[PDB]
Design a protein around this motif. Sequence first.
Motif, PDB file in Angstrom:
ATOM      1  N   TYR A  10      32.259 -18.412  12.016  1.00  9.61           N
ATOM      2  CA  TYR A  10      31.004 -18.037  11.403  1.00  9.61           C
ATOM      3  C   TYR A  10      29.792 -18.296  12.490  1.00  9.61           C
ATOM      4  O   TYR A  10      28.993 -17.773  12.785  1.00  9.61           O
ATOM      5  CB  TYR A  10      30.707 -18.634  10.120  1.00  9.61           C
ATOM      6  N   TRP A  54      24.635 -13.437  17.205  1.00  8.04           N
ATOM      7  CA  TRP A  54      23.317 -12.965  16.554  1.00  8.04           C
ATOM      8  C   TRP A  54      22.137 -13.433  17.095  1.00  8.04           C
ATOM      9  O   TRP A  54      21.287 -12.922  17.323  1.00  8.04           O
ATOM     10  CB  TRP A  54      23.555 -13.057  14.887  1.00  8.04           C
ATOM     11  N   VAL A 108      16.634  -8.394   8.153  1.00  4.96           N
ATOM     12  CA  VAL A 108      17.942  -8.331   8.127  1.00  4.96           C
ATOM     13  C   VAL A 108      18.650  -9.696   7.567  1.00  4.96           C
ATOM     14  O   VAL A 108      19.567  -9.459   6.960  1.00  4.96           O
ATOM     15  CB  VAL A 108      18.502  -7.906   9.803  1.00  4.96           C
ATOM     16  N   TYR A 113      28.598  -4.602   1.005  1.00  4.44           N
ATOM     17  CA  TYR A 113      29.120  -4.396   2.157  1.00  4.44           C
ATOM     18  C   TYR A 113      29.287  -2.922   2.756  1.00  4.44           C
ATOM     19  O   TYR A 113      28.861  -2.045   3.470  1.00  4.44           O
ATOM     20  CB  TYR A 113      30.234  -5.222   2.427  1.00  4.44           C
ATOM     21  N   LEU A 167      21.991  -2.536  10.642  1.00  2.00           N
ATOM     22  CA  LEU A 167      21.907  -4.027  10.805  1.00  2.00           C
ATOM     23  C   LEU A 167      22.219  -4.915   9.735  1.00  2.00           C
ATOM     24  O   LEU A 167      22.835  -6.065  10.057  1.00  2.00           O
ATOM     25  CB  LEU A 167      20.621  -4.489  11.643  1.00  2.00           C
ATOM     26  N   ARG A 168      21.633  -4.607   8.608  1.00  2.00           N
ATOM     27  CA  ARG A 168      21.828  -5.847   7.504  1.00  2.00           C
ATOM     28  C   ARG A 168      23.241  -5.496   7.059  1.00  2.00           C
ATOM     29  O   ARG A 168      23.788  -6.700   6.748  1.00  2.00           O
ATOM     30  CB  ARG A 168      20.967  -5.090   6.224  1.00  2.00           C
ATOM     31  N   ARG A 169      24.002  -4.254   6.966  1.00  2.00           N
ATOM     32  CA  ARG A 169      25.317  -4.255   6.717  1.00  2.00           C
ATOM     33  C   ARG A 169      26.263  -5.117   7.856  1.00  2.00           C
ATOM     34  O   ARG A 169      27.049  -5.675   7.272  1.00  2.00           O
ATOM     35  CB  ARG A 169      25.860  -2.834   6.391  1.00  2.00           C
ATOM     36  N   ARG A 170      25.939  -5.084   8.963  1.00  2.00           N
ATOM     37  CA  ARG A 170      26.639  -5.796   9.962  1.00  2.00           C
ATOM     38  C   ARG A 170      26.516  -7.276   9.475  1.00  2.00           C
ATOM     39  O   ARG A 170      27.419  -7.972   9.636  1.00  2.00           O
ATOM     40  CB  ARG A 170      26.178  -5.304  11.178  1.00  2.00           C
ATOM     41  N   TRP A 171      25.356  -7.652   9.393  1.00  2.00           N
ATOM     42  CA  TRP A 171      25.189  -9.004   8.997  1.00  2.00           C
ATOM     43  C   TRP A 171      25.758  -9.478   7.852  1.00  2.00           C
ATOM     44  O   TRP A 171      26.346 -10.672   7.787  1.00  2.00           O
ATOM     45  CB  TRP A 171      23.283  -9.255   9.135  1.00  2.00           C
ATOM     46  N   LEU A 172      25.671  -8.714   7.069  1.00  2.00           N
ATOM     47  CA  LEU A 172      26.295  -9.040   5.696  1.00  2.00           C
ATOM     48  C   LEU A 172      28.014  -9.070   5.816  1.00  2.00           C
ATOM     49  O   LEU A 172      28.467 -10.088   5.122  1.00  2.00           O
ATOM     50  CB  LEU A 172      25.945  -8.046   4.706  1.00  2.00           C
ATOM     51  N   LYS A 173      28.359  -8.284   6.468  1.00  2.00           N
ATOM     52  CA  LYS A 173      30.064  -8.270   6.683  1.00  2.00           C
ATOM     53  C   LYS A 173      30.220  -9.356   7.601  1.00  2.00           C
ATOM     54  O   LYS A 173      31.297 -10.052   7.348  1.00  2.00           O
ATOM     55  CB  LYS A 173      30.395  -7.198   7.500  1.00  2.00           C
ATOM     56  N   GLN A 219      29.232 -12.464   7.207  1.00  2.00           N
ATOM     57  CA  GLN A 219      29.047 -13.283   6.321  1.00  2.00           C
ATOM     58  C   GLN A 219      30.194 -13.936   5.647  1.00  2.00           C
ATOM     59  O   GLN A 219      30.602 -15.053   5.040  1.00  2.00           O
ATOM     60  CB  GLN A 219      28.012 -13.455   5.259  1.00  2.00           C
ATOM     61  N   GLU A 220      31.496 -13.209   5.793  1.00  4.61           N
ATOM     62  CA  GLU A 220      32.691 -13.288   5.124  1.00  4.61           C
ATOM     63  C   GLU A 220      33.393 -14.350   5.975  1.00  4.61           C
ATOM     64  O   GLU A 220      33.354 -14.616   7.044  1.00  4.61           O
ATOM     65  CB  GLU A 220      33.523 -11.954   5.357  1.00  4.61           C
ATOM     66  N   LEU A 221      34.277 -14.873   5.176  1.00  2.99           N
ATOM     67  CA  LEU A 221      34.991 -16.085   5.575  1.00  2.99           C
ATOM     68  C   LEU A 221      36.539 -15.712   5.977  1.00  2.99           C
ATOM     69  O   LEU A 221      36.980 -15.156   4.739  1.00  2.99           O
ATOM     70  CB  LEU A 221      35.051 -17.466   4.729  1.00  2.99           C
ATOM     71  N   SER A 222      37.226 -15.977   7.102  1.00  7.17           N
ATOM     72  CA  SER A 222      38.272 -15.826   7.456  1.00  7.17           C
ATOM     73  C   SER A 222      39.352 -16.918   6.828  1.00  7.17           C
ATOM     74  O   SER A 222      39.071 -17.851   6.000  1.00  7.17           O
ATOM     75  CB  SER A 222      38.616 -15.804   8.844  1.00  7.17           C
ATOM     76  N   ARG A 260      41.369 -19.002   7.828  1.00 10.56           N
ATOM     77  CA  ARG A 260      41.257 -20.152   8.484  1.00 10.56           C
ATOM     78  C   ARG A 260      39.997 -20.776   8.737  1.00 10.56           C
ATOM     79  O   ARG A 260      39.530 -21.914   9.302  1.00 10.56           O
ATOM     80  CB  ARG A 260      41.835 -20.425  10.138  1.00 10.56           C
ATOM     81  N   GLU A 261      38.966 -20.079   8.068  1.00 18.83           N
ATOM     82  CA  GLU A 261      37.553 -20.384   8.332  1.00 18.83           C
ATOM     83  C   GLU A 261      37.213 -21.753   7.563  1.00 18.83           C
ATOM     84  O   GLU A 261      36.305 -22.380   8.386  1.00 18.83           O
ATOM     85  CB  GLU A 261      36.450 -19.152   7.820  1.00 18.83           C
ATOM     86  N   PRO A 262      37.876 -21.956   6.541  1.00 20.95           N
ATOM     87  CA  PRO A 262      37.396 -23.204   5.997  1.00 20.95           C
ATOM     88  C   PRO A 262      38.402 -24.136   6.256  1.00 20.95           C
ATOM     89  O   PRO A 262      39.460 -24.167   6.011  1.00 20.95           O
ATOM     90  CB  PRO A 262      37.430 -23.091   4.429  1.00 20.95           C
TER      91      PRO A 262
END
Lengths: 64, 603, 32, 178, 88, 459, 103
Positions: free
Chosen positions: D117, D124, D170, E87, G17-23, G25-28, G30-32
Amino acid sequence: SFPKYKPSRLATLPATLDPAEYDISPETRKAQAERLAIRSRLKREYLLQYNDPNRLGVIEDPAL
Amino acid sequence: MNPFASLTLTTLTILTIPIMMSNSNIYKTNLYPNYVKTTVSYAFTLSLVPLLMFMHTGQEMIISNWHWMTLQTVELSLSFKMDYFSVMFIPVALFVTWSIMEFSMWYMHSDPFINRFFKYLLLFLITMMILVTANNLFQLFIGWEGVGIMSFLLIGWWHGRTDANTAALQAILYNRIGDIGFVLSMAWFLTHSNAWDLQQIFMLNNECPNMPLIGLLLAAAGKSAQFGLHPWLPSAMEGPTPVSALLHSSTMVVAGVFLLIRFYPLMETNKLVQTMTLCLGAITTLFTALCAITQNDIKKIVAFSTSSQLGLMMVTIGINQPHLAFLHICMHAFFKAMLFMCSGSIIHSLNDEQDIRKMGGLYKAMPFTTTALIIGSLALTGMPYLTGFYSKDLIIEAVNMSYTNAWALLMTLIATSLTAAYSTRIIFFAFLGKPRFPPLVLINENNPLLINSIKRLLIGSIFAGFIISNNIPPMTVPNTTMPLYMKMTALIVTIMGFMLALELNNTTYYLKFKYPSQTYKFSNMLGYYPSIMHRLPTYHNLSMSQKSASSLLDLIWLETILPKTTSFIQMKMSIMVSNQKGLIKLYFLSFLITIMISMTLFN
Amino acid sequence: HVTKDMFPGPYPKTPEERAAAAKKYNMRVEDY
Amino acid sequence: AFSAPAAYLTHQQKVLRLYKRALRHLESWCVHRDKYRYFACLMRARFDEHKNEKDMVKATQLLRQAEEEFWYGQHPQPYIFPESPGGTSYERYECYKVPEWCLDDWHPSEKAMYPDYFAKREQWKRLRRESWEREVKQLQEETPPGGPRTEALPPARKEGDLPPLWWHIVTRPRERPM
Amino acid sequence: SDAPPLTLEAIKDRVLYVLKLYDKIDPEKLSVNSHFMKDLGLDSLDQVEIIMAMEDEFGFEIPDIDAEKLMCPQEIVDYIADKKDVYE
Amino acid sequence: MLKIIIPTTMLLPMTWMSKHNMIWINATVHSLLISLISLSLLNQLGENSLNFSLTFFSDSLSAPLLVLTTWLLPLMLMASQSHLSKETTTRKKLYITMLILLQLFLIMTFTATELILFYILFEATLVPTLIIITRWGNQTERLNAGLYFLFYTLAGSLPLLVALVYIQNTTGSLNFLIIHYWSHPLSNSWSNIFMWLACIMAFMVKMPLYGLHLWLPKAHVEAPIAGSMVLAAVLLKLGGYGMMRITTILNPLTNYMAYPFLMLSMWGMIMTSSICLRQTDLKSLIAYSSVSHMALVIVAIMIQTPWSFMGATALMIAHGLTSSMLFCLANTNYERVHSRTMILARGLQTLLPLMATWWLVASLTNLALPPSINLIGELFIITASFSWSNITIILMGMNMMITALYSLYMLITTQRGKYTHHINNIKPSFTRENALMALHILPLLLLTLNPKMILGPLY
Amino acid sequence: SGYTPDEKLRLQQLRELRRRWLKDQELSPREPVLPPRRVTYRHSIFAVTHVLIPVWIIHYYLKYHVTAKPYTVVERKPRIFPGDTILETGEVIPLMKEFPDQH
Ligand SMILES: CCCCCCCCCCCCCCCCCC(=O)OC[C@H](COP(=O)([O-])OCC(O)COP(=O)([O-])OC[C@@H](COC(=O)CCCCCCCCCCCCCCCCC)OC(=O)CCCCCCCCCCCCCCCCC)OC(=O)CCCCCCCCCCCCCCCCC
Ligand SMILES: CCCCCCCCCCCCCCCCC[C@@H](O)O[C@H](CO[C@H](O)CCCCCCCCCCCCCCC)COP(=O)(O)OCC[N+](C)(C)C
Ligand SMILES: CCCCCCCCCCCCCCCCC[C@@H](O)O[C@H](CO[C@H](O)CCCCCCCCCCCCCCC)COP(=O)(O)OCC[N+](C)(C)C
Ligand SMILES: CCCCCCCC/C=C\CCCCCCCC(=O)O[C@H](COC(=O)CCCCCCC/C=C/CCCCCCCC)COP(=O)(O)OCCN
Ligand SMILES: CCCCCCCCCCCC(=O)SCCNC(=O)CCNC(=O)[C@H](O)C(C)(C)COP(=O)(O)O
């Protein structure tokens, strides 16, 4: 006929019942144009100062 | 020896352990709400024992364990009173809190700060317990302020919402207006009876004068949301549904009535205060019932119902039947908590919708919820041989046959009729018509937490009235013989209210439209009381706060008098003295003048 | 970082002074 | 909220807004669906009978008694959607919206969790750093002399360009961040 | 809450479902990119009625300044998605 | 007492010979150590006093104020550690020297068995404060504030010197023990009226009384943080301590000479509480709150009943601690914001939760919540004034309601709501500020367990 | 009325751009990442460490400290009726005088 709404200090006249914007003259349209112009100028200045990545502080407000 | 004191202190102590553990590791997991719920359940099942012992023997006790401080001839100690009222109100409050916490474990599952919410609920419960069991006026004041502060913290649960902060500040304002009278009573009692302890106050005051009783009545009016200071209770619904179900429904709002009950030995000795409190109760119950008749938000309707019940028990206090008022407190707790829990279930099931205009056919969509709400409404309206009956029927009977004000009689009768009417309005508008919610049906109640929490209060609101009524010693003279027409006045007026409300609500199906009358506008806008009283006084006061106090006096005239006048005078004198052209002609002329003056004057 | 002129000033009888103040407060001259 | 406003509302816009408000309050008055449909059709009928009027003096003479009649029968407790500026849950979640820049103050131990992240975050940030330099010049060359007249912003015109002043639109937190 | 995460295709399906029950327009002719004033010959008041219908059906209300400039089902879907942060 | 005065003096050579990067550590450690030594003075006896020698004596009125004075200095150092980062070593050492001199003068003042020595140190406490205000102040109005603070005090206190030397000429001694034992009634005469006014006005100007409070908002706003806390916590209590010491010779004249001051205070409490509601500044709001509380203390002292004195002492200590905490919190906000305006930064609770907790606790304590010593002093004064006259309850209740209103307004405006968008330098709160708030608040909740330690000699 | 072409283009790019940013935001999976480090039965222990121990402490405190001082715990004297027997003395309270009983 319907009973009239009498405005007071703590209950102001609604915009819809106000008669100023029904007596429209070209100078009124000009005045609205100037108001929107200065408001948009201020908004553009604020947005230019607001999205700057280099700025790392509080945007000083002359009005405040 | 005599486990009464041990258990009656242990319940209040065990209610405190999770607060101590709030800094431990369990606070950071999802096990905290279940931990708090189990602790409350254990406290309830432990406090159930002193109730049994009191029922068997009639045990009464006061414990003064810790001696706080002595002020000359006055002693302040941490004293708990465990009389009938305390030992009976501990289990009811603990039971209601247990059910509300179990309900909240489901209602507030998506809130990130759920653990903090449960901690706040437990803190409020502890403070209310302190208020109930208090023996001297200082401890009672401690509880009085603690419950108010917790209500402020829980009303404004959502900090982003401006209306939440507004409602919280409004509640604090009204509670402080009541605290003015509370402090007046405390000061009078100390300066005249030389003690804040209830025992000495009762003994030394055979004929209590008007001032302390008027102060106590003002405090009770402030915290029980009577007519003068009512709007804070309906406005306190900006908080989460469990908060309004526990705090502003059945437990915190009965604090003023409980205060008036506690000082009943002094209330009987005065006739003017009894008349004043009876009148206050009558006017407030009528006003809130009338407002609730035409309300459209479900939580608003139930809040106004709570206010009406509070006014009814104030009326009961007025006719000098404090024990009956306590019994009605106990019954109202059960069924009003039921009603709020059902309303919260509906709101959650309908995607956070509160207006009854968007609730349609839920009699078949939500069977357990509608059956619980029907039972609760029938108990509230006074259906015979239910929990609300054993209190309200006796209230009306005692009120009908006492040398009281007639206008209060009429107001109470109209108020109970309107109570039946708005119960009919809730049921008809939320469970009978065709559905009106958005197409995406998300109806679901199949959660064990909600079902169990509702069913416990269901068994309670069915049987507890009978159990408590038949399991306590008599404390009031029965009204054995009564006229038959007056014996049934409660049932007749309730049935008349049912019929009138149903007939008037059925007319909304007819395809005719008509603009509202003045009466409808008056009743919907809450008598115009919240508007005017929240715009005329406040503004004016605030205006003065900037015009007279701040700018005109502090910044203008107080500056002009002492510092500015001195500065101006000294500047003028300095300019006058130091302005010399440097000519020695004038200097020596002045020297000659002063030589002559001293020669002829000082001799 | 604000100049002396920006700060509030005493009520002005003259139109020229009035115009200067209206421009300072970011509003129209006949709207002030 | 998204669209910039105009200096004034035309007569058509006033008529449409009055129509919407009247229908909303009529629905509030008529609780049930069939009654609402019947009276909404009746209101539409009484609303379109002056559709074809030509002179503007009489049309402005109308829509005044219409507003007075609306104010007289406005249902002093109308229905408000829960997320509307008058609803029960208007600003309920405004206390959960934490700004994006707060993530710049996180401890490195906290940043050790969620590494991907933060990598996307750096990407970004670089994108914004270049895009701002392009946008300031584009907006400077596009605005007319004497200052903007309306608060409408132009889109991106070149290939690699991005819309001016996009970062804070955004990167809104969310509708329900928690 | 238990609210499902509504997606773009679900939003488009709901929009077309609401429109197809508006008998003033024929279901066969309408498309996701069809206009309102020209391709379907609808009045301004009619467009306001469609906007209010979607308002009622989706549970959130659209401001007038944004509602008066929505003329196609596709841009209505886009506006709803932007409001609700969808999304895909 | 010299076991306290001598280490405070030795703090100066300790500071001046310290290394350039270790002055704060040494000053804080030894100030805390000194506070521990001062704790021994608290064990007062029901008899006369702890008459140490011919020059210094300690009572149960002087003990709480002395302990608070010795405890405040470490907090002042931790508060000043922030904005003195870019200051040269000599100027930082001078700042610490001024703070130490202020503490030493206050310590010598509070015992001061003789009234002339008390007056000498009572005016000596004015030089380091003025230097601190006018030297290390940010705004350009610090000069005018310093002038106001100097002259308002000195004009009131100059006739006091003449009154004291006159009393010594007639009575023959100014030792407080002899003054108390040989006290005689004051006849109703113009000369005695003016003696009363001279002996009272010097302490009423410093409290301050409503109508002479113009210097306090300026001095509190323009001063640095340490000056603000030392003004709000200890320097305001000098007037009340002196008044309670000196009212022993003004009887029975006070019985009717208290009416103007009683009316002024009982109306100025309402006026300043109302002023707090409409305020665009935080430090000004806190200063006006201090004025209201000190007006209540003035009423209590002028009533002259045992409950009045007990409540006055309790309120003195409680208000000192609470005002110091509030000024600390306002300074922490101002350091990040750099504006000092209430509505410029909003919704800080979402960004700084623990500071929001500290704000809530400080506001609750200021709100006079039971069983905190704030409400103990408040309620004692309320009961005493009710005994004085039954109509005072109206004014006191109005003051209580307005106090709650403005306290929660201060909390809500700065903590609740939506955060301001164009501020992105709200860094997470340091450990220093959290420790400062904790050390401010914990003594209050600890003293609520043993109230008799702060209830004065008439307990 | 309606969208101007510039407005449409700007909204489209902002939406992308908003949809790219929102996507983003997802956690993988191993992200946490959490670094690990350490230094009937449930109710059975709960009733012991939460109920029994407070009862013991409070009973001790009341029995041997609170009751040591006089008048700290004062109990209302039990009701005495005709016919009961007192434990301390053993005397019997005399009965009533046989009031006339009909219905
Ligand atoms: C010993 C003999 C025993 C037998 C006694 C008699 C037996 C029964 C007799 C029947 C008596 C009345 C029963 C009908 C109740 C009225 C219902 C009705 O017709 O409403 C439609 C009609 C207007 O409705 P709308 O605008 O078309 O509704 C729009 C849609 O329907 C929108 O609809 P929505 O869906 O939104 O909601 C509809 C809602 C909305 O409805 C409303 O608008 C609420 C207004 C109705 C409440 C009035 C009921 C009681 C009034 C008490 C007033 C206390 C004194 C206040 C003094 C004020 C002085 C200014 O209505 C309801 O839900 C149900 C209404 C309540 C009915 C159930 C309870 C009533 C029975 C209890 C009353 C009498 C029995 C007492 C039993 C004890 C034995 C003595 O209401 C009226 O016309 C008002 C009638 C009474 C008002 C009296 C106040 C007049 C004051 C004028 C000035 C006087 C001079 C002052 C000088 C001051 C100088 C300083
Ligand atoms: C299990 C125990 C629980 C209770 C523990 C209580 C501990 C209390 C410790 C704190 C004490 C507070 C300071 C008290 C100072 C006042 C008394 C002091 O002035 O007395 C002096 C004496 O003070 C002691 O000698 C020295 C005490 C100083 C140290 C206190 C203990 C804690 C010090 C911690 C310092 C830092 C520790 C190391 C950190 C790295 C002079 O006495 P003197 O006037 O002649 O007596 C005449 C009467 N005689 C003849 C009968 C004696
Ligand atoms: C502004 C902010 C606050 C500043 C401080 C305010 C407090 C100062 C007010 C002074 C307190 C009272 C002063 C005098 C009190 C004595 C009572 C007297 O005033 O009443 C009558 C006195 O009559 C007249 O008042 C005579 C005095 C009139 C001249 C005094 C000036 C009055 C107005 C000036 C106000 C200015 C105050 C601020 C100055 C900067 C009673 O007549 P009598 O019983 O026979 O004489 C009583 C005295 N005896 C017994 C010793 C003989
Ligand atoms: C913030 C600004 C406050 C300013 C405070 C200034 C006012 C203080 C009150 C008056 C001060 C002067 C009093 C004199 C000092 C007391 C000495 C004394 O008591 O001796 C008297 C002497 O009394 C006097 O001489 C008083 C004369 C006063 C002259 C100066 C006047 C100053 C202003 C007077 C009015 C102020 C009062 C209200 C002030 C309110 C604050 C502004 C006894 O005289 P004997 O010679 O012993 O006679 C015995 C044989 N029969
Ligand atoms: C319960 C509350 C009741 C409230 C009642 C309110 C009053 C109802 C009666 C209102 C009276 C009127 O119609 S006032 C009539 C106002 N004057 C006109 O309508 C003249 C021309 N109208 C237009 O041009 C519009 O745009 C139009 C063609 C309508 C649409 O155009 P579109 O093609 O762009 O949709």
